[PDB]
Amino acid sequence: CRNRFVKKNGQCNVEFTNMDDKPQRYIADMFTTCVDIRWRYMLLLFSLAFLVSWLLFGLIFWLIALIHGDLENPGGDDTFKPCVLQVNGFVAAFLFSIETQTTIGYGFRCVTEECPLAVFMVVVQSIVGCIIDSFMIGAIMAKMARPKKRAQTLLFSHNAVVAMRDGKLCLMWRVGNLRKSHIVEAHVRAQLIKPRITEEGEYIPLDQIDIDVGFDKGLDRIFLVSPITILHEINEDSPLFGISRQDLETDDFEIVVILEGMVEATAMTTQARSSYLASEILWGHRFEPVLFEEKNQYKVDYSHFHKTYEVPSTPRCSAKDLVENKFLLSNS
Amino acid sequence: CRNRFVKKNGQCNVEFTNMDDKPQRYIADMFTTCVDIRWRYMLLLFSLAFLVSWLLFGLIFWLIALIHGDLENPGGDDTFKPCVLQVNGFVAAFLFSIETQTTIGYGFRCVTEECPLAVFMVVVQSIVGCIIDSFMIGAIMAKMARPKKRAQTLLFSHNAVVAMRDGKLCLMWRVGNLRKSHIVEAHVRAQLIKPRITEEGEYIPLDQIDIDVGFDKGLDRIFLVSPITILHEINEDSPLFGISRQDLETDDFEIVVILEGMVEATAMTTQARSSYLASEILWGHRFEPVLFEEKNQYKVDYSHFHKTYEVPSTPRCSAKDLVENKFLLSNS
Amino acid sequence: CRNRFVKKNGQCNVEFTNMDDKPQRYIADMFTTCVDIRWRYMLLLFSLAFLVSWLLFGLIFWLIALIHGDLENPGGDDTFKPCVLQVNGFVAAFLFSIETQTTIGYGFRCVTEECPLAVFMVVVQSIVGCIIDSFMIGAIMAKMARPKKRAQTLLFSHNAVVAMRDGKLCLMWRVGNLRKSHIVEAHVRAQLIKPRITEEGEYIPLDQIDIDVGFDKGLDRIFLVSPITILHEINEDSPLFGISRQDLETDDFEIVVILEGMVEATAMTTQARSSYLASEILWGHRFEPVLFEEKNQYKVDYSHFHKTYEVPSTPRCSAKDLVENKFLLSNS
Amino acid sequence: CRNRFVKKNGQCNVEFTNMDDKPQRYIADMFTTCVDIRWRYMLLLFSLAFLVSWLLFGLIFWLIALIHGDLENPGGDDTFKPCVLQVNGFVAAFLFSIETQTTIGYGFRCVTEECPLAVFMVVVQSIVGCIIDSFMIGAIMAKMARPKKRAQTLLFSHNAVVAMRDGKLCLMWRVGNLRKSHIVEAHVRAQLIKPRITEEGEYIPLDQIDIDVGFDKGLDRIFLVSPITILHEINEDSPLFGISRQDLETDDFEIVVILEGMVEATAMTTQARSSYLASEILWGHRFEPVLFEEKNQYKVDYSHFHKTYEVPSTPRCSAKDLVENKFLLSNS
Ligand SMILES: [K+]
Ligand SMILES: [K+]
Ligand SMILES: [K+]
Ligand SMILES: [K+]
């Protein structure tokens, strides 16, 4: 009866455990994780970094002010010039650190030509400042631009159907584009998922078996404007070959459907997924047409996308029987 | 007689309606939309964000100035130090907010060490400032760099022709590069569009049928320097197999041509398209050569690109007849 | 005798003329051109933009200062507050414009709360400022990162050779990686270039004919660490099938070799090219091995890369003859 | 006995020498190198650039201050206005240079309307400033984002095994994903590495021979969630065809395994590698299942990933013998 390996939203149902090296391997790939975490976390993270550099330098400057004796003479006089003007304490040293690294530079607190170490520190802090910004930009740039978001404007039919097209019995499901932007170099893939035991007695917890959508003839490549109906012809080499309408309400297995393509604007490949259980496949049905001609253009009614209608003319046996039977009649 | 599913510019003629979830699905993919809108909109949008953060913080600062009693003593004295110097009112609080977030920091209005909340607010606003900038950069970066713009320096012939090459009857159309930059890993695809009814009585509003350009042999991949003429050999497995010159002025259908490749500079796939109606296909014609040798290099005259000439030697029947007839003569 | 369509550096020898729409099509694709121009031009271009916005706003501010009467009272007094402090003339108005847009904000020239138009202008200029920066970043980012630069660390043999390998006569040329960085998902392509006339009497100025490197079997995909020798087996379906050693010093044609792959760091496809004329192909030679085992690793001597040695055992006739002859001996 | 061409981490064991043009070819591709060097080097490099521009301009400003006579009158008076206020010497000129290029602009040192050359210099320095930043961003952006880092969250089995599946003798190794992020458009490749001599007596130091993973049928493409076991069927066309269990402890050769795919977030192809020596291949073993059903989802125990168990039922001869023998029994 259960269960489902890929959910309908495409989300995969599985978890990794006892991975061992996970910590040290994630440090090297660390950038990859950083961009998948919630915004608030990536942000708080960066503000944490800012805050830390501001405090660090602030301390240096305050230390410098303390030792130089600026805390007691922040503004100096004819006989005395402070390292950095107007640093009277911690908060003052803090403010100056921020003003410097942010490049606001109000100027009320200001470096003088006196201390080479203060000057140096400012130099270092400036450079540092650029570095952190650069990381933030890249991170934000990257995360903002993730192509997996496009998979949410792509659509699969809630069900898959089996039915005759041009003398052949075919498993079909539908796909559609919810944006007027194109999916470039798009193509599809399908797989039958279920556990099995090889004739040698080897148990495969879940075997993934290719469902042929026409890859060989280059037919898995699609041009997607209006919703396309995807066809798997069930034949000798099909994993569904010996399955009939009654085997559908009995058998336990899963079909996984994939759509890969490039977001038109960024040319970044996105991968959309969904799944049909044997109990989500409608035998003897056909998809309702979503496309019609309004005279000087075409329109797509998306409310008909998921809808199917009964075709009582449809055979209830397997392709296998269907074929075999043909060769009794034709054989006699 | 009508109509056309893809226009000649490649623009697709169709519209989506009754999409349902459109709003909630567009929010998750929201970045994808943001980059396709007109510049002025993306910009005004960002300036809207800036303006909003400036006003927001300005209010905070003004509120802080008001309560602290700075509005009445903006410059302070020996006994009194304001939260932020020189904020006498709304506009002053506004100016300071901008100066801070932009990092101009003229310094006439300046934070003091007095209020931790003012200090904090400045901290927050600074961080915020970086965040908005980062988004703007990414957005601008992205939109500026869109690869679909390259499709406008790529070219299709205004017409397609049918004619004999090396003993075979072929549908041909032409493609060309208008930049001296290359289209990397380029390849082509073709499809016949028209409504049809399966032998089972199923209506397909528009069926998309592959036109073989040599995909199987890897011949759909092209190296495009000078204009290339693309050939579809019309044979047993061709959708045009049973079509003759007279069927061209009668029949209603459409041929869709695609060119996919990578912009040399960004290596981002662009997809160019165009279309030929049965009435835009010239039977019995041939393309005028645009390439000639000037002795130590080659030149392309692009004014000859679209031009075709009559070949009266050309057969007016279908490949089907042509073949079948060959097997009467050779059969007798 | 001449000439060469692709030079040895990969540079293509051809020019486009009479393109017509070139100007209006380049405006839409305008970004693509901007990144291919020399640095100095892209830079001067941007500094031109900066300079133009600084001058524009400077004028506005100066106009505002003039009308308000600030030019005569730049510092104001108890009874008079200028729009922007310390603007006494053109250069002053200019300096302030720059200080504002650059966010330096020394603060000597500073906006006051008086003029909403000055304030507004500052607002506008700030926003504008960000916009130009963003473009510069993207442009610089893009151009700096162009993948076509990697093609200069990729290498082709100065000559191609023909010779026997495992009982088959093969055209071979060599390729090599000059960086320890990998070329990801790399593959090769070859083509024979030369003008020809179809049996129908149609002249093709230059026909491009695929040279099979094993694409069908997936053998055109290579893993390139040490230099690889690329093999074209000359057989029935080869365009070189009927060519012998003597036809090489006579015939005029060209072979074009391509290597496509992804720069490991940016995963951006680069395309490297080179060319062999019939007179650059060495019949009866073999490449000198550049790889040898030094015991706990391997080394590549690149000075042997281009070198070839004579194999007098090599047949001087065409594959065609070679085959045909085999079937006399075996036929008698 | 030795040695290994690709290490187990994927690192390649080889070195390039006598490359000749290496310096001039690396200058054109210079960006590619810059991003592979250690952070500290790329950073120090950039800080070097900053420091150099600060010093350069500082000198100009100091020169200008010197000649104008500002060094003796940094603050000016009613009758005298300095080029740049408050530059009394070298360090002062330095500080101002930094303040300007960084856009901090404290304002204590400030340009006046007096010198057009000082003004000009500031203009130039500002523009320059933007330029360097832009490069730093791009560099940091790029390097931070390198897709080769993802290959460290991808996994190969420590050993490869040979064993029967569904009546066929197969070489198998395992692959797994250590992140819950997907590897998009992933596919695999395998190759047998070893030196050989063609029947013509030509020595190939290392020949790379394709191991068929199902490329022809499109089966080399995988959907990787849980660890997949990769199968090479050993048959007539297999390079391992004539190899038996005893040939494994004798022969010296290497098998190289590759996994190519796209980092889900950036859609940038990464290439992962590893290697199995004839002595790292376990004949007669089978992989321990890492996947099991916990009722409403699936889990992967990664500690079982590398583990194999003995299958005494396994034949010790080559596929060749195995086949040939079948045709004695069936032949008699
Ligand atoms: K500033
Ligand atoms: K200032
Ligand atoms: K600033
Ligand atoms: K400032």
From Swiss-Prot, chains A, B, C, D:
Residues in compartment: Extracellular: 64-89, 107-115
Binding site for K(+) 4: G105, Y106
Record field: catalytic activity: K(+)(in) = K(+)(out)
Protein residues bound to K(+) 2: T103, I104
Subcellular location(s) per record: Membrane; Cell membrane; Cell membrane, Sarcolemma, T-tubule
Disulfide bonds: C83-C115
Protein name: ATP-sensitive inward rectifier potassium channel 12
Portion of the full sequence shown: 41 to 368 of 429
